[PDB]
């Protein structure tokens, strides 16, 4: 019983130095890359073997043509924004679109854009409206909100199409996306400075990457130091939490994929 997601990203770069695509688009299911396209290859290709084995050549050929179309649209969209801001030189434009399928069967969908890695326009598929961050974003917001048919297209795509694609992709990649590898969880005692003891709860070998780790007394602890959930580079993740003891004064709690662990 866990959440899955499908996401398509788009990166456009104006005046890229010779070694940088003007345009990249990558799809993800959860943390896995499923699809790639850029302005150098001009080809949509699978980044997961379970996508490769399950979608016939016509899929890649069709979406190749679609991605050439969207690459051109992106380039014109960026140029226009740069006109609006009166920006010269290299700038970035980004878009993320996707949906979540939760356990209860409920869904979410989103679409947002970024100029130089900052929030520009965020879509509301319920009020069918665009949140603009500045005056320039408001100007694009008015053009987009005047095309009622496009807002409705977008609502439908996020709520029906995106979820249909996700379910199809989840079935293709079920052995990867729906498996569990439980964490190997150790507790280290380190003297960090003389007299002063700190406890490190470390976890590795786990998938999915989502995991909860905390320290409790006999009541949660204050000043817990958290390590990022990091990829081990074999399809599994590592992560840790530390506490520092008080002079003359504890257990590590981990929760992963519906399994709860205590180390005292």
């Amino acid at each position, epitope marked *: 019983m866990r959440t899955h997601s499908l996401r398509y990203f788009r990166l456009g770069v104006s005046d890229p130095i010779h070694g940088v695509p003007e345009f990249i688009s990558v799809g993800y299911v959860d943390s896995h890359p499923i699809t790639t396209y850029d302005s150098v290859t*001009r080809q949509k290709e699978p980044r997961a073997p379970w996508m490769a084995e399950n979608l016939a050549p016509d*899929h890649w*050929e*069709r*979406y190749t*043509q*679609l991605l*050439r*179309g969207w*690459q*051109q*649209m992106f380039k014109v969209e960026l140029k226009r924004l740069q006109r609006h801001y009166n920006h010269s030189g290299s700038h970035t434009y980004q878009r993320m679109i996707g949906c979540e399928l939760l356990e209860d069967g409920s869904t979410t969908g989103f679409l947002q854009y970024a100029y130089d890695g900052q929030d520009f326009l965020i879509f509301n598929k319920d009020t069918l409206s665009w949140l603009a961050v500045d005056n320039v974003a408001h100007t694009i917001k008015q053009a987009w909100e005047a095309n009622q*048919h*496009e807002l*409705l*297209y977008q*609502k*439908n*795509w996020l709520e*029906e*199409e995106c979820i*249909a*694609w996700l379910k199809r992709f989840l079935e293709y990649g079920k052995d990867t996306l729906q498996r569990t590898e439980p964490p190997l969880v150790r507790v280290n005692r380190k003297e960090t400075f003389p007299g002063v003891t700190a406890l490190f709860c470390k976890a590795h070998g786990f998938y999915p990457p989502e995991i909860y780790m905390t320290w409790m007394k006999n009541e949660i602890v204050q000043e817990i130091d958290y390590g990022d959930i990091l990829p081990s580079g074999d399809g599994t993740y590592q992560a840790w939490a530390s506490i520092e003891l008080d002079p003359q004064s504890y257990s590590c709690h981990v929760e992963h994929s519906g399994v709860h662990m205590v180390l005292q």
Partner: antibody, heavy 109, light 113 residues
Framework: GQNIDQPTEMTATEGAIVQINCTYQ??????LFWYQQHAGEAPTFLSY??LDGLEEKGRFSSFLSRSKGYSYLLLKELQMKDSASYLC??????????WGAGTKLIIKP | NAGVTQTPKFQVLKTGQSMTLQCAQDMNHNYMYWYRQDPGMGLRLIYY???????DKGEVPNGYNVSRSTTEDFPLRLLSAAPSQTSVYFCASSNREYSPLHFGNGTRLTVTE
């Protein structure tokens, strides 16, 4: 991206009402369109539905039932100038535009 | 704007001749399409182009080729006129893959042996 059906021909009287039905079967859907094509002329965009319900522009309405896989184009207060082919088309999951064989509308004065 | 300009309106060919149908739009549209309309069936896609620099086969591409070296123009070439190619041809454009098509005024084409 499977199938789309609309009647070959309908006949109605000037001043009356006509409902042109279009049924479609698909797994995946990005909207259904009606175009108007006069004898010897280009098809011209009339309507776009993607959500359930009814859209109204003067004498023309377009309905869509997603669970029925069904749309109609409703013409009220028919004029001789409404004598034309009405083309049903929808977009599948890959934006393939799937075209009906079209409905020839004959108006009787 | 003019919309979609398609020429010629009419053409007779002998079996084996080649022919180019011209089509231009001044609407900065990314998508251009070639369709044939034959009695008793839906518009059939011959070729389309998602943008300048790319083209792809429709449902009935055999006997035809296209090019899209500009946003504006999408010429259709009949390689070797056959009677089966007697039809009405329509050039169309759309801003995007899901936006409404704007149609040219069509080319009525008859091939005779």
């Amino acid at each position: 991206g499977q199938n789309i059906d609309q009647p070959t021909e309908m006949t109605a009287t000037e001043g009356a009402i006509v409902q042109i039905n279009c049924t479609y079967q698909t797994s995946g859907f990005n909207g259904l369109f009606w175009y108007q094509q006069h004898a010897g002329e280009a098809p011209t965009f009339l309507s776009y539905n993607v959500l359930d319900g009814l859209e109204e522009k003067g004498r023309f309405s377009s309905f869509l039932s997603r669970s029925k896989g069904y749309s109609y184009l409703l013409l009220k207060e028919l004029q001789m100038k409404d004598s034309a082919s009405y083309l049903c088309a929808f977009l599948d999951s890959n934006y393939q535009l799937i075209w009906g064989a079209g409905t020839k509308l004959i108006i009787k004065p | 704007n003019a919309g979609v300009t398609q020429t010629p309106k009419f053409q007779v060919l002998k079996t084996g001749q080649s022919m180019t149908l011209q089509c231009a739009q001044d609407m900065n549209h990314n998508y251009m399409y070639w369709y044939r309309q034959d009695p008793g069936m839906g518009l059939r896609l011959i070729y389309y182009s998602a943008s300048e620099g790319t083209t792809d086969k429709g449902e009935v591409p055999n006997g035809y080729n296209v090019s899209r070296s500009t946003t504006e123009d999408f010429p259709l070439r009949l390689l070797s006129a056959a009677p089966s190619q007697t039809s009405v041809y329509f050039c169309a454009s759309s801003n995007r893959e899901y936006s409404p098509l704007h149609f040219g005024n069509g080319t009525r084409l008859t091939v005779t042996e």
